[PDB]
A paper describes a structure:
Diversity generating-retroelements (DGRs) are unique and unparalleled generators of massive protein sequence diversity. Three fundamental components define DGRs: a reverse transcriptase (RT) that has a unique sequence motif, a variable region (VR) that forms part of the coding sequence of a [name] diversified protein, and a template region (TR) that is nearly identical to VR and is located proximally to VR. Despite the sequence divergence of these proteins, they all share a C-type lectin (CLec)-fold, which appears to be an evolutionarily conserved scaffold among DGRs for accommodating massive protein sequence variation. Variable amino acids in these CLec-fold [name] variable proteins are solvent-exposed and form ligand-binding sites.
The variable protein of the [name] prophage [name], which we call [name], is predicted to have a CLec-fold. The structure was determined and refined to 2.81 Å resolution limit, and the entire length of [name], amino acids 1–381, was modeled. [name] appeared by gel filtration chromatography to be monomeric in solution and was observed to be monomeric in the crystal. The structure of [name] revealed a single globular CLec-fold domain that strongly resembles the CLec-fold of two previously determined bacterial [name] variable proteins. Like TvpA and Mtd, [name] has the formylglycine-generating enzyme (FGE) subtype of the CLec-fold and, like these other two proteins, shares structural homology with human FGE (3.2 Å rmsd; 116 Cα; Z = 6.2; 22% sequence identity). The FGE-type CLec domain of [name] begins at amino acid 112 and extends to its C-terminal amino acid 381. The variable region of [name] (amino acids 341–381) is located at the very C-terminus of the protein, as in Mtd and TvpA. For all structurally characterized [name] variable proteins, the nine variable amino acids in [name] are solvent exposed and form a potential binding site. We observed that [name] started to unfold at 70°C and was completely denatured by 90°C, as monitored by the loss of ellipticity.
Residue numbers in the entry: 1 to 381
Write the structure that this text describes.
């Protein structure tokens, strides 16, 4: 027999997808549906963003031909974070668990990185008309908040659109079970559920007391790179020239609450004004750290407030940390400028226009486990 069930499935997936998708197999021989996104240059999105390959395609100094994105939200099976259709998306796992489960699959496999997310979002935006966020999804308890008649299959068994939070029933939908408009390119061969269903942990991005920090390029792809809190790998961004510099340096970019507002230590949560990007951080009340869940600051991605002196470096636009267009009317940005925060992207079933390609939620610490937050695998090489 030259024939295997596992290889024949791979071929079927490759065929049906015009060669855009495949199935790779994990260390433990489990299926990972993956969609290829070939390398593009920044100038192909908009020449005013700079030049060279998008960071998603640079791993350990080497420029890659393409990357592979998990076609579906990850699910944890045995001890691997795999990517398959028709299942309840992984949830209630923290950043380190997600990062680990992703790597367990073997060489190449990793927790999808902020650089990859950034690559897909920008490419999606440009390729679908360079207008708004082209993509929809499970952003209202099973269906799309923009489009009621687009729904997936709810794991809960409840009707799309029914808020069952109080009954402790989730609004997650089985992966890819929504229509093709819930896939990044409008076709069945697209990446599914990027927008909605569950938020997803991404690697290579971090907040420390409001200072923005990243793992350079797509270096977050290695199974060896230290993304713990103590890691010397994290770099900040200089705002004046956008160079990668050591954390704590003078002119580094930070997410901050609004200049026209102030932290209220009333043990009561307030959204403190349009989120602002400048080089300083308002001092929070004493004793507020990564385990403090209090006041924050949000803003629609298009509406992020740029500091009076600041020219936002292209680097931030490319990694989807600051808007480049304002044609984007969905996707909300959240940030707590105190403690260590790890990013989750895309939005879930209960957000609304908050969900979207540009949705970024930096209010939680790496330890947080929530029923509407999960992860998905990617592969390079
Ligand atoms: Ca999602
Ligand atoms: Ca407060």
């Amino acid at each position: 027999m030259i024939f295997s069930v596992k290889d024949s499935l791979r071929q079927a997936v490759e065929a049906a997808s015009g060669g855009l998708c495949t199935v790779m197999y994990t260390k433990k021989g489990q299926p990972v549906f993956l969609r290829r996104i070939p390398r593009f240059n920044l100038e192909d999105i908009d020449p005013s963003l700079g030049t060279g390959p998008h960071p998603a395609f640079v791993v350990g100094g080497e420029v890659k031909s393409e990357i592979w994105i998990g076609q579906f939200p990850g699910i944890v099976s045995n001890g691997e974070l795999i990517s398959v259709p028709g299942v309840d998306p992984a949830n209630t796992i923290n950043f380190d668990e997600a990062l680990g489960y992703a790597r367990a699959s073997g060489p190449g496999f990793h927790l999808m990185t902020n650089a990859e997310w950034a690559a897909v979002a920008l490419l999606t935006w440009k390729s679908r008309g360079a207008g708004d966020d082209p993509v929809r999804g499970n952003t209202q308890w099973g269906r799309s908040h923009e489009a009621q008649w687009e729904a997936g299959t709810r794991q809960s068994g409840d009707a799309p659109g029914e808020d069952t939070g109080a009954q402790g029933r989730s609004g997650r939908t089985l992966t890819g079970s929504g229509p093709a408009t819930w896939r990044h390119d409008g076709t069945p061969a697209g990446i599914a559920d990027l927008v909605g269903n569950v938020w997803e942990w991404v690697a290579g991005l971090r907040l420390v007391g409001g200072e923005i920090q990243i793992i350079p390029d797509n270096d977050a792809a290695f199974a060896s790179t230290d993304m713990s809190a103590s890691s010397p790998l994290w770099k900040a961004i200089r705002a004046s020239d956008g160079a990668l510099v050591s954390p704590g340096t003078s002119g580094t970019l930070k997410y901050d609450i609004n200049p026209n507002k102030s932290y209220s230590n009333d043990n009561t949560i307030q959204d403190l004004g349009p989120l602002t990007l400048h080089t300083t951080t308002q001092t929070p009340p004493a004793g507020w750290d990564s385990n403090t869940y209090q006041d924050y600051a949000s803003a629609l991605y298009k509406d992020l407030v740029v500091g009076t002196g600041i020219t936002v470096p292209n680097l931030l636009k490319v990694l989807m940390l600051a808007p480049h267009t304002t044609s984007i009317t969905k996707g909300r940005l959240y940030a707590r400028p105190y403690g260590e925060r790890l990013p989750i992207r895309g939005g879930d079933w209960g957000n609304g226009g908050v969900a979207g390609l540009a949705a970024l939620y930096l209010l939680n610490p790496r330890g947080s486990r929530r029923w509407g937050v999960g992860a998905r695998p990617a592969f390079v090489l």
